[model samples]
Target: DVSFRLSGADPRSYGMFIKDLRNALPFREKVYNIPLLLPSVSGAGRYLLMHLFNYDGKTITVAVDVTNVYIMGYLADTTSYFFNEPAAELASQYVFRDARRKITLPYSGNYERLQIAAGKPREKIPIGLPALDSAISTLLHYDSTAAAGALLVLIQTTAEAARFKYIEQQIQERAYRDEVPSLATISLENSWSGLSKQIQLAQGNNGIFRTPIVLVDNKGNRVQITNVTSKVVTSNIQLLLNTRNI
Candidate 1:
């Protein structure tokens, strides 16, 4: 039997973080067209190479020097097309000539791995208040210290209560989850905020909605939204917003 160590942050949380991180990066959208070659020629022994097309349908060609290779006669006639074996052999020889070339990989991936490992250190910091004792001693010298301290304690208690309530609401709403839906109401402002409001309402005030209701497949890419309606307050406003693959 083999044992495995279960360590680090919750897998669910880690996955959510990774999803958000990927969403923040810039992605390039480029199209690479297939190469189109013309028909082969007769015994002329001339080589005509076709270039690859870019996203904008522009041709791109890169020139490489192969002067050292001696070309023999064509193996066949007009319809026969074949690879240049001698040129390929010469290229391979040139590439392997310097066998001692030093290959250095970029350090970014290693640095990220180190950072992730360090972030998972298991340790706990103790919480204490030595400065509070000194402050209390100083306040004891004042005549109004007790009343001030009582009022301060009341304010702190209220603040803590409010914070706890807010945290409870956030947890119930799944605010930390990447797919958590917004619970905002929609408005007829025809603006981004209005759309957000609709999304929030459709998701429910407790934020349970996660899957998209309306989605468009644009060139095989998924584009979706939580709410599409511009009106947040109208009863007729479309609430369900999402995108789905067809």
Candidate 2:
């Protein structure tokens, strides 16, 4: 049994990890029964164990750590070699690139999609603000250690409509994946003490609520990156990830 485990986020996030992993797998049967428990498992074994681990503020791929899997050195030469090779042969290297390729679930079939099309998402009923805040505070307190080092907060302005549209499609697949446009991103600096406020500022006075994406760093000090252009047509995430050698 390949008893691989994912460490990070809540049960919903764990659900996404498993679903996304399976979606990318050519032989989905190779993986099974990924447990989503309160306290996730630790350590690496035969298969690669992934942690939504850290963000060094330098590269995006550095945020995740793939343990116990070694990259095959020659697998990158696609022009001369490894052309039309069987997936098993090429995948033996277990690179993230091949594993990340998959068809995203489409909208219009699932229950969530149906509800969304009907314009009824079952919003949060009015709850006592103080009660909710207190509950959230307590939850955040315990979630500190389990949280990711870097956070991606999508400022809901331009794409809020399309965002909510496809978001339900992803949810219908039960992945809970955070595939969205990020207008603002946050990271841990001194402590997780004031993170709530930082997150609040990112979402408050703008939209009702926003999904916060976290890259959970299991073992590392919280750190930030430098030398990023605030304005750019395309993202530097892929460049940084490759540069960081993750």
Candidate 3:
């Protein structure tokens, strides 16, 4: 039940500290690798949270508020720790270094909530780490199915082979249902944050002339750009319903 005060120096430092846990101690069990993300969350009131995603598509995250030191479990087993007996035996044990600064609080039984889904550990498709990357490639090129054989492989995973194949089927289903691009892409799916960069790179933002308008005309045609009153612009714009056409 020991607690440590929040350091004004850097909260991110805690992430790096937790990241090195695997190499810090050698446990009897085989553990997975480092997490894909260690980013800080915001918008919510001040509090610390630790959410983990296992290879088996399990979110072994616990929601707990801390007034003291809370030990984080390093669960990397193929089977989830939640449904299994002796859930603690499958988890890695944690101990801090011998320092006078460390405080030991009274022990209380399980004080947190373990959930199936929790904070997103970065929007990684690992969707099995390296295996997923190659799988996406397979799906992009080959997507044909039949009674004799099958196609469309979105991801290939070593740890969760069955689950990965299940995911592949879903991808094929969505791809087939999109009814548009058989192989959907960024533009197809929607959302780009695309116009953001384009607009930022335009004449106004990049220190170019800040003209209100530009005209394109034929060789013999004469065209000029002029500023109008805000009142006039609004009236005309309201009359012309379609801004795109304007």
The local distance difference test score of each candidate is 0.23, 0.22, 0.22
Candidate 3 lDDT, 1-246, residue by residue in tens: 111112221223222323332123222221011111112222221123334332333332221212111222211222111112222222222221222232111121121121112111112222222222233233222222110010111101111111122222323333212211122121211111221122223324542223433322223233332333221121211111111211
| TM-score to native of every candidate shown | 0.13, 0.16, 0.16
> In model 3, which regions exceed 4 Å deviation?
1-5, 9-12, 25-84, 89-113, 116-246
lDDT of 3 at 150: 8
Off by over 4 Å in 1: 1-128, 143-204, 208-246
TM-score, cand. 3 vs. native: 0.16
What shift in Å separates residue 133 of candidate 1 from its native position after superposition? 1.0
Candidate of highest lDDT: 1
RMSD of candidate 1 to true structure, Å: 28.5
lDDT tens digits, residue span 119-204, model 2: 44223111111222222232222222111111111011101111122222322232233332221211221112132222333333
Say what the RMSD of model 3 is. 22.8
- Off by more than 4 A, model 2: 1-8, 28-246
